[PDB]
Write a protein that binds this ligand. Structure first.
Ligand SMILES: *[C@@H]1O[C@H](CO)[C@@H](O[C@@H]2O[C@H](CO)[C@@H](O[C@@H]3O[C@H](CO[C@H]4O[C@H](CO)[C@@H](O)[C@H](O)[C@@H]4O)[C@@H](O)[C@H](O)[C@@H]3O)[C@H](O)[C@H]2NC(C)=O)[C@H](O)[C@H]1NC(C)=O
Ligand SMILES: *[C@H]1O[C@H](CO)[C@@H](O[C@@H]2O[C@H](CO)[C@@H](O[C@@H]3O[C@H](CO[C@H]4O[C@H](CO)[C@@H](O)[C@H](O)[C@@H]4O)[C@@H](O)[C@H](O)[C@@H]3O)[C@H](O)[C@H]2NC(C)=O)[C@H](O)[C@H]1NC(C)=O
Ligand SMILES: *[C@@H]1O[C@H](CO)[C@@H](O[C@@H]2O[C@H](CO)[C@@H](O)[C@H](O)[C@H]2NC(C)=O)[C@H](O)[C@H]1NC(C)=O
Ligand SMILES: *[C@@H]1O[C@H](CO)[C@@H](O[C@@H]2O[C@H](CO)[C@@H](O)[C@H](O)[C@H]2NC(C)=O)[C@H](O)[C@H]1NC(C)=O
Ligand SMILES: *[C@@H]1O[C@H](CO)[C@@H](O[C@@H]2O[C@H](CO)[C@@H](O)[C@H](O)[C@H]2NC(C)=O)[C@H](O)[C@H]1NC(C)=O
Ligand SMILES: *[C@@H]1O[C@H](CO)[C@@H](O)[C@H](O)[C@H]1NC(C)=O
Lengths: 448, 144, 48
């Protein structure tokens, strides 16, 4: 009935099969297509193109080649340099631009027509800052990998001012994964409460080097600022004594989601993981999980505005596409329970601020949910912690020996003072001065 | 439009978002790209045909780190203005590890120049050794 | 199994009553902080 084309800019692989985001995008177009209630009457056509992922000029033509053919929404380059070029293209010619990975949103770049389904590191850095207060740390240590990473944690760098943390920010060495000189210096500094900021590939390779230097013991706790801690092979580490906590937005409890993930690993047909990688085999990363949810947020909007048609836009002869402005408002007001919980956007700039994290940690069973974070709420932890009992029973025998006496001069009488006293200091005379000597010898506490 | 007319070298847009686009253009078509302001050079962006005459904040952040050792500070305080600014001083943020500094990084409020609530909190914390990271326009308005 | 329970740290020292400690692959353990001492009667110095 209706043909509707989407953008398909992805990374150019040349030897192996296509990337996890492109497979997620090919799957999400195919999944909605036979599912004829959600988008029932339209024939969504993917238009995939491939860039070298570090060329804004190559991403510029592949954007224009899709709009010269005519699309509805480009579903994002996956790098900060190339996305900013295509964001300026989609802002000018009018089409929405759907983003699934984080970038540095420039505060003076007044743009519309873009949303980012990745959870914002403004909101995430609260949740790490909430989590370090739950464990009551004072000697935290941020380890990042890219110079971009200080932007991604800037609310944590800005908090020795308000709270009592003492940040000791370090950087992984570039051009390698040999972080052997780093963790030796971190063992020397007794860095016991490390917060990593890595991808899940470098989060796996940092732990084997942490294991080989014996640095994963009972008095090391690792917070991973990532959303794919659950996809690590934690089997060498499960008995190690190491506490390690992360976050997860991917619902592993919903049977609808778990049906997709079970269907995913079958439909991958991907190059097998090396056992020296340290990763588990069949799981959706949070990169491909959002790209699956990227189409479904758009698929809500095409229902509520069905009269939209495909127009062939020209970059050189730039014209604002007339259906986009109406279509963009349905995107920013969309609500959908995808793979990553609810997806609600931001009434300001199109970032994702209100979402649902599931704070997971390592116990001897494996990874395990020990709470839930929310921006509107705080930590809803003390999920498994239960009660905090206490029992000491001082006043050794079992009392501080209630002494009954009576006021008589000069034996027991009230003490004269300018300030009125309270307790045992009220009384003076012979017999309490006797009783202070009896309490010194026998070693008991008394209450007059 | 300049290369369709034909030029020798584009002398730079003056912003990080717009320069990265033209840097990819000058790398592809071959002309040199001459830059006069700093940007975040992405470490995985393998490009040629560009030079930046602005002094790199990798090299500058040594000189501030040399200068705080000359005055023998222990209670420094970085105040920046843009979230870009943590990249411009990252060798100073990475040095309570090697030396004995104690960084207490703060940020100027956006959408204004009214930094009245900031310096009240900095006076309360006895912040006596402030390192600003501003443009010279905001360096004037912060002192009044 | 001592590595997988994180028990090879700077404050564990293992004496092996064996004469083939030298034939172990100690490469995962060399940086671990663990002191481990043994004995060897086999001369690895003699060129003969
Ligand atoms: C199990 O016990 C051994 C001690 O009985 C551990 O030896 C430690 O680790 C290395 C391995 O040899 C030693 O480093 C050597 O040190 C010498 C001396 O120069 C250094 O002197 C002091 C140390 O007091 C140090 O502060 C300096 O910076 C020098 O580096 C060097 O000449 C060698 O080249 C080599 O670097 C350690 O010194 C030694 N430490 C202690 C406290 O004994 C052995 O490694 C243990 N097994 C582990 C930890 O897995
Ligand atoms: C890192 O610190 C964490 C605390 O923040 C540790 O979580 C600890 O988990 C350990 C066991 O992994 C627990 O210590 C003991 O374990 C039982 C729990 O077993 C429950 O599950 C079994 C299922 O087989 C079942 O029989 C019952 O439902 C049991 O209740 C506790 O109930 C005991 O009281 C005992 O403490 C703790 O639950 C928990 N806290 C502490 C302080 O141990 C984590 O394991 C730490 N890493 C370590 C110790 O290596
Ligand atoms: C086509 O998609 C619709 C979604 O709009 C499916 O209908 C419901 O999907 C939700 C998914 O969260 C289930 O929880 C409900 O139970 C579904 N409703 C039912 C089964 O009545 C619909 O199932 C899909 N089509 C097919 C053939 O499965
Ligand atoms: C596609 O087009 C027609 C347009 O009339 C569809 O008819 C309606 O479609 C909407 C949304 O898809 C439904 O909510 C209505 O219930 C449909 N019926 C009526 C009477 O309005 C129809 O679904 C499709 N037709 C074909 C041949 O595929
Ligand atoms: C934190 O945990 C849950 C989040 O759903 C809230 O209550 C749960 O749901 C019902 C109704 O209250 C009850 O079974 C229990 O109270 C909870 N069940 C669990 C934890 O399994 C709870 O109120 C939340 N607390 C907040 C937000 O302060
Ligand atoms: C998104 O909405 C929140 C309120 O929930 C508010 O901070 C603002 O309007 C938006 N966030 C940002 C960072 O602009």
């Amino acid at each position: 009935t209706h043909v509707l084309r989407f953008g398909g800019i992805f990374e150019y692989v040349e030897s192996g099969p296509m990337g996890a985001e492109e497979l997620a995008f090919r799957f999400a177009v195919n999944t909605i297509n036979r599912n004829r209630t959600l988008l029932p009457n339209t024939t969504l056509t993917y238009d995939t193109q491939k860039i070298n992922l570090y060329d804004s000029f190559e991403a510029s033509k592949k954007a224009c080649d899709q709009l010269s053919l005519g699309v509805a929404a480009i579903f994002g380059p996956s790098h900060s340099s190339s996305a900013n070029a295509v964001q300026s293209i989609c802002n000018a010619l009018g089409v929405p631009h759907i983003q699934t990975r984080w970038k540095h949103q420039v505060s003076d770049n007044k743009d519309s027509f873009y949303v980012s389904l990745y959870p914002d590191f403004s909101s995430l850095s609260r949740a790490i800052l909430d989590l370090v207060q739950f464990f009551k740390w004072k000697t935290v240590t941020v380890v990042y990998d890219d110079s971009t990473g200080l932007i991604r944690l800037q609310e944590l760098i800005k908090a020795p001012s308000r709270y009592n943390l003492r940040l000791k920010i370090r950087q992984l060495p570039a051009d390698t994964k040999d972080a052997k000189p780093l963790l030796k210096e971190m063992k020397r500094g007794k860095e016991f409460h490390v917060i990593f900021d890595c991808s899940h590939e470098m989060a796996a390779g940092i732990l084997k080097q942490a294991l080989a230097m014996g640095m994963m013991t009972e008095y090391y706790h690792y917070i991973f600022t990532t959303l794919d801690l659950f996809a690590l092979d934690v089997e060498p580490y499960r008995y190690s004594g190491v506490n390690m906590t992360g976050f997860r937005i991917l619902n592993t409890e919903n049977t609808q989601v778990s049906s997709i993930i079970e269907k995913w690993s079958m439909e991958r047909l991907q190059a097998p993981p090396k056992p020296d990688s340290g990763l588990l085999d069949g799981f959706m990363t949070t990169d491909a999980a959002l790209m699956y949810d990227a189409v479904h947020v758009v698929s809500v909007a095409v229902q509520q505005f069905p009269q939209m048609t495909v127009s062939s836009l020209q970059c050189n002869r730039h014209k604002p596409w007339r259906f986009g402005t109406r279509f963009m408002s349905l995107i920013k007001e969309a609500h959908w329970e995808g793979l990553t919980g609810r997806i609600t956007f931001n009434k300001t700039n199109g970032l994702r601020t209100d979402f649902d994290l599931d704070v997971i940690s390592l116990k001897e069973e494996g990874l395990e949910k020990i709470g839930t974070w929310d921006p509107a709420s705080g930590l809803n932890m003390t999920e498994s912690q239960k009660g905090k009992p206490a029992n000491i029973t001082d006043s050794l025998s079992n009392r501080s020996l209630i002494v009954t006496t009576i006021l008589e001069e000069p034996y027991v009488l009230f003490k004269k003072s300018d300030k009125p006293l309270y307790g045992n200091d009220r009384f003076e005379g012979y017999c309490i001065d006797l009783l202070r000597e009896l309490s010194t010898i026998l070693g008991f506490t008394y209450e007059i």
